[PDB]
């Protein structure tokens, strides 16, 4: 469950916060994958 997933539909604020956290983690992973030192 992440905000990037367009099919995701939050039900309440707890699910919304979990989606925000998952989106942040996925963005961190993407940045580390795209990083080239």
């Amino acid at each position: 469950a992440s905000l990037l997933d367009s099919n995701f539909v939050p039900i309440n604020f707890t699910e919304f916060v979990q989606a925000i956290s998952n989106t942040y983690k996925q963005r961190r992973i993407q940045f580390y994958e795209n990083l080239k030192r």
């Binding site: 939050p10 039900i11 919304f16 989606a19 925000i20 956290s21 983690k25």
Partner: protein, 309 residues
């Protein structure tokens, strides 16, 4: 939820425009691991084994065999919850301020909720980056009026039980003296069996300027890189510059077995459910974030301070 709460929908739609924190460049991907916590502390237990004596030869009959012991160490990391408030326009009143070019009141500095949240999140991310790099929370260029924090909440610069070197004010502009102090610190570094790891160095802009001077056709940067390669099993050495440091040099390995960043999963800015409303067109919103979560092995970080006086 999006049908009932407009603010959550706006946050979801705009959350993709927030730039990633720059602190991710100071750690390796394996070094960072999220934890599920908002306020409190997290106990980390490290288990180790040791050899009591030489191994026993299996020949003929024998009943007395050498033993292997075990030991444990408990580490307590504190986490703190912080909040900010900001004023913004109301959704039902945005239409009365939606100009052709923009939305909001330039005269009263009133912005739509999405833009206000984006700017506040960017500022809070910058503050989090400053805390992670320094270990102190302040909004002044002087660095004073620091917010008091809990114990066991340390940054890369204020971590205790590490290696500290100080360059006297008389030698404040002598790269030879600075490099002598750096060599002393590197010699005092204790990486044990984990010495085969890439290394990271962070310097202030003044030190970065001093590094590119010719070595007293070689540069002090090259000499430092070779010196660090002499101890890190000749692996990668990365150099970074930060305006948040002042006459400070930080050297540490990018090894998950020595330094670990375990931030809370709610560390980055998150909207709060409470929204203040009244009869006017001005509403207030709250943003939450969590600070803390750096763990380092003893005597693994070199911190050089060039005293200016």
């Amino acid at each position: 939820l999006f049908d009932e709460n407009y603010y959550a929908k706006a946050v979801a739609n705009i959350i993709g425009e927030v730039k990633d924190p720059i602190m991710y460049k100071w750690f390796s991907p394996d070094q960072i691991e999220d934890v599920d916590l908002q306020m409190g502390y997290q106990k980390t237990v490290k288990w180790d084994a040791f050899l009591n004596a030489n191994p026993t030869t299996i020949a003929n009959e024998v009943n007395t065999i050498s033993t292997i012991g075990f030991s444990s160490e408990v580490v307590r990391l504190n986490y703190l919850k912080l909040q900010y408030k900001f004023r913004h326009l109301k959704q039902t009143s945005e239409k009365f301020y939606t100009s052709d070019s923009y939305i909001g009141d330039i005269n009263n500095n009133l912005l739509p909720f999405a833009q206000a949240y984006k700017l506040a999140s960017s500022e809070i991310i910058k503050l989090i980056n400053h805390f992670v790099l320094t270990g102190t929370v302040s909004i002044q260029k002087d660095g004073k009026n620091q917010k008091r924090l809990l114990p066991n909440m340390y940054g890369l610069l204020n971590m205790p039980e590490q290696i500290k070197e100080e360059v006297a004010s008389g030698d404040k502009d002598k790269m030879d003296k600075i490099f002598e102090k750096i060599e002393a610190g590197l010699s005092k570094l204790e990486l044990g069996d984990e010495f085969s790891t890439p290394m990271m160095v962070i310097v202030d802009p003044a030190t970065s300027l001093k590094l590119v001077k010719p070595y007293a056709c070689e540069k002090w940067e090259d000499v430092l890189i070779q010196t660090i390669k002499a101890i890190n099993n000749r692996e990668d050495v990365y150099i970074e510059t930060s305006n948040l440091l002042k006459h400070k040099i930080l050297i540490y390995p990018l090894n998950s077995e020595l330094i670990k960043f375990k931030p809370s999963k709610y560390m980055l800015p998150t909207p709060n459910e409470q929204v203040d409303k009244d009869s006017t067109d001005v509403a207030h919103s709250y943003i939450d974030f969590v600070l803390g979560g750096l763990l380092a092995t003893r005597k693994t970080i070199l911190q050089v301070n060039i005293k200016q006086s």
